Amino acid sequence: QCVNLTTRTQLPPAYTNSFTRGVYYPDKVFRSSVLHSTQDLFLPFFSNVTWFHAIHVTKRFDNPVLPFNDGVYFASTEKSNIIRGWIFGTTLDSKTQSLLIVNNATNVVIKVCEFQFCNDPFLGVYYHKNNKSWMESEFRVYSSANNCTFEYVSQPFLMDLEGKQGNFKNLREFVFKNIDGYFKIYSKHTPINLVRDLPQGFSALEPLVDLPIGINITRFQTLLALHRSGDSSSGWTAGAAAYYVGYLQPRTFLLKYNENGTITDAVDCALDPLSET
Amino acid sequence: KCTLKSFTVEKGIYQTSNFRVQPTESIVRFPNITNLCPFGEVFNATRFASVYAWNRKRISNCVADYSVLYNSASFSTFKCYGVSPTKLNDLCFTNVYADSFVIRGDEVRQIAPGQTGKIADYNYKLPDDFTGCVIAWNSNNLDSKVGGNYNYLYRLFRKNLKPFERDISTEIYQAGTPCNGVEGFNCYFPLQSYGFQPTNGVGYQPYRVVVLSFELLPATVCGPKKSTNLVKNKCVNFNFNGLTGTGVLTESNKKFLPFQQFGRDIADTTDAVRDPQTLEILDITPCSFGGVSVI
Amino acid sequence: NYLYRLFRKNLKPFERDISTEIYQAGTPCNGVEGFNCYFPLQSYGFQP
Ligand SMILES: *[C@@H]1O[C@H](CO)[C@@H](O[C@@H]2O[C@H](CO)[C@@H](O)[C@H](O)[C@H]2NC(C)=O)[C@H](O)[C@H]1NC(C)=O
Ligand SMILES: *[C@@H]1O[C@H](CO)[C@@H](O[C@@H]2O[C@H](CO)[C@@H](O)[C@H](O)[C@H]2NC(C)=O)[C@H](O)[C@H]1NC(C)=O
Ligand SMILES: *[C@@H]1O[C@H](CO)[C@@H](O[C@@H]2O[C@H](CO)[C@@H](O)[C@H](O)[C@H]2NC(C)=O)[C@H](O)[C@H]1NC(C)=O
Ligand SMILES: *[C@@H]1O[C@H](CO)[C@@H](O)[C@H](O)[C@H]1NC(C)=O
Ligand SMILES: *[C@@H]1O[C@H](CO)[C@@H](O)[C@H](O)[C@H]1NC(C)=O
Ligand SMILES: *[C@@H]1O[C@H](CO)[C@@H](O)[C@H](O)[C@H]1NC(C)=O
Ligand SMILES: *[C@@H]1O[C@H](CO)[C@@H](O)[C@H](O)[C@H]1NC(C)=O
Ligand SMILES: *[C@@H]1O[C@H](CO)[C@@H](O)[C@H](O)[C@H]1NC(C)=O
Ligand SMILES: *[C@@H]1O[C@H](CO)[C@@H](O)[C@H](O)[C@H]1NC(C)=O
């Protein structure tokens, strides 16, 4: 059973600037101290990206609708792991196969399966004042599933779940693509010391997984977590976090491979005449 | 002399042919085989359901091996339609459907596509274009009990079943004054039991039957992809993860990233490869070759 | 009356293979019909 959460102020969408981000390894080929020009789905340098907030201060809870054209770059600026997972699909109401990725308090679940997805799916972590402990208590994402084709659960572990105070100190960059029936996820993590921005510099994302799913994805959504300790739809705290979403398109990039074999710099081929030269 | 196409040769040096070292001891290297679907769960299962409620299982995302099943020789019948008992190892399909049940001796013939019969029409109808295999083995010591094993049931009365159709709703069948859902005249029971006895002969003894069907439309489950040993310091024809080449493999000081398999030199030529079995990096260099001049 | 070879390990162009020795698919049966070996010939069964 899921209930739509109320008490969410409406604010116009905010878009910010991405500076040389959303670059990943095109393939698994090892190259040393060379220049490689490759044409593939990529994110433009110095582009516009959708910025969504989560701050208590309204509570700025953002889990809106987002299309999935050809691939999505998802950056998460966090300090206490508020954002939990992602959902991919077309109809989102059990009449079409959908992919679900959730990193709950103990395991990681990747499940391709038919969900009756709620309009407002979320996680909920309860904070105890009698004893200092943060634990996941609520998971309102899907109702039921009859057919369920792909299952993957990682080994059990433990996560912090505590809400720290201060500026953001973690960045998690992800790239999701769906080509030839294969769902490719590239990932990287970075330590940062900013309060609100999309950090500059160069960061090449290493591939994480290539799942043989073979479904059609034209629509994707995010899943965050809230803190509880009001009513079932008013008594919730968001927790500071932010995430930026960008859309990839077929572009040509010139990558530089150093002696270590990692991508250290890249240039867009259609940004400015200098980079084209 | 043949090169110049003349019987006299002037003083000098002439390029005739090119000496090349033929590759020897060709090797194929594929990743470790450590993911097999539970075929034993389908076969070695302690109990099987009725033929009208046959157990259905999905098979995908493994490294399957059908050679052990064929070479087991414990199955009385192994009939494959659309495929052969051999050559099945190196074929990939998107998914596999396994249907498990128990039948009698004469019922073996009826479990086949294009074959008529009461059971083939009311219990389990195979499609005309069925592709897959059927494996039947005797279970006189497991599915037969003294006094009669009546646990296995088959539909007897029915008005036709589509291929791969499951019908759990088997309400009382009316043969024509209607009895209104009550046992009586003009309406008999739809189900009937087998009653396997130890005394029953080969024509009535129980038989566990599993039907495997392969459906393809990316492939998820493939064959064992057997590999060979690794040899160095020789001109070798190598096959690393589908990448086929010729040359000598040597120890390399290059350090590959964990997600990178093979390396390419300038101008997109393979220079080093990492073998998936032990994650070892080997430099590939073409074996000795070059022109041969006659002085 | 008309028969065709069904089991064989390939033929080059324009050859005749009158020998129909039993074909081994992989424990060998040693020239006896049984497991891991099937008849190499099959009939057509033409009907009106
Ligand atoms: C959240 O809101 C949506 C729409 O704002 C609700 O969706 C409705 O669900 C009922 C029953 O499930 C349907 O009869 C309506 O047709 C739906 N409306 C629309 C516009 O699709 C949803 O039920 C709400 N969630 C709750 C109340 O928990
Ligand atoms: C990124 O997208 C935004 C909105 O999709 C662009 O901003 C819009 O620019 C047009 C004119 O080009 C204005 O009419 C709109 O009012 C702007 N949107 C808003 C919300 O003000 C923006 O130009 C795009 N590119 C960059 C680099 O930001
Ligand atoms: C996080 O998700 C995992 C996987 O969905 C949960 O692990 C399962 O928990 C149920 C309930 O006890 C068990 O029946 C399953 O066997 C578990 N699957 C495993 C271990 O692979 C886990 O419980 C979830 N964590 C929390 C805090 O709810
Ligand atoms: C102590 O914390 C745990 C969570 O780890 C909670 O389940 C328990 O209720 C707490 N103790 C009391 C007395 O509330
Ligand atoms: C599940 O798969 C079957 C396959 O035939 C399909 O008919 C059915 O609509 C799917 N969904 C459910 C809820 O059964
Ligand atoms: C995806 O869409 C194509 C459109 O041609 C269709 O053929 C295919 O069956 C669809 N796949 C799924 C999983 O819906
Ligand atoms: C590779 O990276 C290391 C640091 O991890 C560095 O010391 C070295 O110079 C780099 N280049 C090599 C080993 O060729
Ligand atoms: C059943 O289990 C035994 C022992 O585990 C194994 O040797 C046999 O191959 C299994 N059956 C099949 C059909 O593989
Ligand atoms: C592959 O399997 C062999 C045999 O157990 C083992 O020695 C080797 O470490 C394995 N390699 C990998 C990468 O798992």
Side-chain angles (χ1 to χ4, degrees):
Chain A
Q1 183 60 42
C2 72
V3 178
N4 304 334
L5 73 165
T6 59
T7 318
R8 276 158 78 258
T9 51
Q10 277 68 31
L11 191 150
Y15 292 166
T16 182
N17 195 353
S18 171
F19 308 85
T20 61
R21 289 267 170 193
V23 60
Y24 60 97
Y25 293 85
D27 63 358
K28 302 183 178 179
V29 176
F30 173 83
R31 309 173 197 275
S32 312
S33 304
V34 298
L35 277 300
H36 190 237
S37 287
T38 185
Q39 188 274 331
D40 191 35
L41 277 296
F42 278 110
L43 185 82
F45 287 3
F46 307 95
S47 60
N48 64 356
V49 293
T50 80
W51 188 0
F52 292 163
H53 290 252
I55 182 163
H56 161 79
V57 166
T58 67
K59 309 307 156 66
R60 196 55 264 180
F61 210 78
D62 287 271
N63 48 3
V65 302
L66 282 87
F68 193 103
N69 293 78
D70 291 331
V72 176
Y73 164 77
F74 195 97
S76 303
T77 309
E78 270 180 334
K79 78 185 79 156
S80 173
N81 196 4
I82 301 301
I83 304 164
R84 285 305 176 83
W86 311 272
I87 295 163
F88 306 85
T90 61
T91 59
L92 280 290
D93 280 324
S94 282
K95 47 182 179 301
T96 314
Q97 276 273 354
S98 42
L99 190 148
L100 187 153
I101 296 169
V102 164
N103 189 358
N104 70 354
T106 51
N107 291 66
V108 182
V109 183
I110 303 177
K111 163 187 271 151
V112 185
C113 184
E114 42 179 23
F115 310 86
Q116 193 170 2
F117 277 117
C118 199
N119 287 129
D120 291 327
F122 62 93
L123 267 292
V125 170
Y126 195 85
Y127 168 52
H128 285 104
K129 194 179 178 182
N130 288 337
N131 57 354
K132 321 301 290 182
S133 293
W134 304 63
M135 61 79 71
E136 184 265 332
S137 300
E138 200 55 51
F139 175 87
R140 299 216 184 276
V141 173
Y142 60 92
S143 179
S144 179
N146 205 10
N147 303 338
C148 192
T149 181
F150 199 98
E151 183 68 27
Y152 182 76
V153 177
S154 278
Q155 293 299 318
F157 51 81
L158 73 164
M159 182 179 72
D160 297 330
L161 283 77
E162 67 255 6
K164 299 177 78 67
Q165 287 297 278
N167 50 0
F168 294 127
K169 50 176 178 289
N170 282 317
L171 183 63
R172 294 179 66 188
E173 312 189 61
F174 290 109
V175 159
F176 310 96
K177 294 197 298 181
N178 189 359
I179 178 68
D180 304 309
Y182 267 107
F183 203 54
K184 306 180 180 180
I185 297 89
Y186 314 77
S187 167
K188 191 166 91 183
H189 184 282
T190 306
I192 55 173
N193 203 0
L194 59 93
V195 64
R196 56 104 182 167
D197 207 9
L198 191 49
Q200 60 100 24
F202 197 76
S203 296
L205 318 183
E206 322 200 343
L208 187 134
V209 75
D210 205 329
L211 301 162
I213 305 315
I215 68 175
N216 294 332
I217 295 170
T218 54
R219 178 65 179 86
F220 86 104
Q221 195 188 353
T222 178
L223 298 177
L224 284 86
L226 56 86
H227 300 174
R228 280 177 178 178
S229 180
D231 294 331
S232 176
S233 296
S234 55
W236 51 269
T237 318
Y243 64 93
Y244 314 84
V245 171
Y247 282 63
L248 322 173
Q249 70 275 17
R251 296 295 207 78
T252 304
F253 267 38
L254 171 69
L255 305 160
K256 163 192 285 287
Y257 290 78
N258 68 337
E259 60 271 354
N260 278 137
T262 64
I263 302 171
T264 187
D265 201 321
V267 285
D268 202 293
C269 277
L271 183 87
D272 49 340
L274 179 58
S275 298
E276 178 189 349
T277 305
Chain B
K1 280 168 75 175
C2 286
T3 284
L4 282 72
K5 295 183 181 294
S6 179
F7 273 43
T8 186
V9 172
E10 298 89 0
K11 179 253 287 180
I13 173 167
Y14 307 94
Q15 214 271 314
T16 65
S17 66
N18 304 299
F19 172 75
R20 308 165 75 187
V21 167
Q22 298 297 88
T24 55
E25 305 170 352
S26 159
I27 56 172
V28 291
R29 308 221 84 214
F30 282 141
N32 259 335
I33 171 168
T34 45
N35 195 42
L36 272 71
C37 292
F39 282 104
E41 186 67 32
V42 191
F43 281 78
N44 267 304
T46 63
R47 56 173 292 167
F48 275 178
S50 53
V51 74
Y52 81 94
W54 40 268
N55 269 16
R56 175 83 160 182
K57 194 167 179 295
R58 272 270 295 275
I59 287 185
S60 79
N61 298 113
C62 301
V63 183
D65 181 74
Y66 309 90
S67 66
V68 57
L69 306 177
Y70 180 56
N71 298 295
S72 182
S74 63
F75 313 124
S76 159
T77 293
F78 184 89
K79 215 164 202 295
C80 288
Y81 281 155
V83 292
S84 63
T86 182
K87 206 185 158 64
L88 190 61
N89 276 110
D90 57 348
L91 265 68
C92 301
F93 303 97
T94 60
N95 50 359
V96 184
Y97 313 133
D99 311 334
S100 310
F101 43 87
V102 170
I103 66 173
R104 60 191 192 87
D106 294 331
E107 202 163 348
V108 173
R109 295 180 293 108
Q110 292 173 353
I111 306 300
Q115 294 298 108
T116 189
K118 289 162 59 62
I119 292 158
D121 215 327
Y122 309 139
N123 287 291
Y124 192 54
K125 174 64 175 66
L126 276 297
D128 196 14
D129 53 350
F130 171 60
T131 60
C133 298
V134 172
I135 307 166
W137 72 88
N138 202 302
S139 279
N140 205 1
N141 63 305
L142 296 174
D143 289 337
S144 162
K145 179 63 176 163
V146 290
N149 192 309
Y150 289 78
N151 275 108
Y152 304 104
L153 271 285
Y154 67 96
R155 199 97 42 78
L156 192 68
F157 273 37
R158 179 169 170 78
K159 183 176 178 180
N160 301 113
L161 268 189
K162 298 151 202 290
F164 293 141
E165 181 166 30
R166 193 163 178 91
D167 215 324
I168 202 75
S169 58
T170 67
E171 58 96 25
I172 189 70
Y173 178 76
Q174 278 137 22
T177 313
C179 48
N180 310 98
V182 186
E183 196 270 329
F185 209 79
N186 283 340
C187 59
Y188 301 103
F189 208 84
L191 304 184
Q192 182 51 259
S193 191
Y194 285 109
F196 301 121
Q197 299 292 325
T199 306
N200 282 130
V202 68
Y204 297 135
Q205 266 155 29
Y207 280 106
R208 286 185 172 203
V209 178
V210 65
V211 188
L212 310 164
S213 72
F214 321 115
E215 195 270 323
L216 183 136
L217 57 93
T220 65
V221 58
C222 284
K225 286 180 177 180
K226 299 205 207 163
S227 304
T228 56
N229 290 116
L230 181 69
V231 58
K232 312 163 188 174
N233 307 110
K234 299 172 191 60
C235 184
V236 168
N237 204 324
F238 55 89
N239 189 359
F240 283 96
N241 263 7
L243 183 63
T244 62
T246 55
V248 59
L249 324 179
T250 183
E251 292 293 327
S252 179
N253 290 318
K254 297 179 185 291
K255 183 60 66 64
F256 291 169
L257 287 168
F259 65 95
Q260 281 170 330
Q261 295 299 319
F262 70 89
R264 295 215 295 242
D265 189 358
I266 296 90
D268 279 7
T269 182
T270 308
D271 196 18
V273 76
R274 186 224 307 279
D275 53 355
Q277 296 182 0
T278 175
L279 319 174
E280 278 191 345
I281 297 89
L282 294 174
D283 171 359
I284 300 145
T285 45
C287 54
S288 296
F289 68 94
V292 169
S293 306
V294 158
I295 295 92
Chain C
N1 291 103
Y2 304 100
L3 272 287
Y4 66 93
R5 188 85 53 77
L6 188 69
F7 274 38
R8 181 168 171 77
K9 60 179 77 67
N10 300 114
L11 278 180
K12 298 151 206 294
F14 292 145
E15 303 158 11
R16 195 163 173 92
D17 205 314
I18 194 72
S19 63
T20 66
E21 60 94 24
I22 194 67
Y23 177 73
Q24 280 136 22
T27 314
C29 47
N30 309 97
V32 184
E33 197 272 329
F35 213 73
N36 289 342
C37 48
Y38 307 99
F39 207 72
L41 306 183
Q42 181 53 260
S43 191
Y44 281 106
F46 294 122
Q47 312 262 4

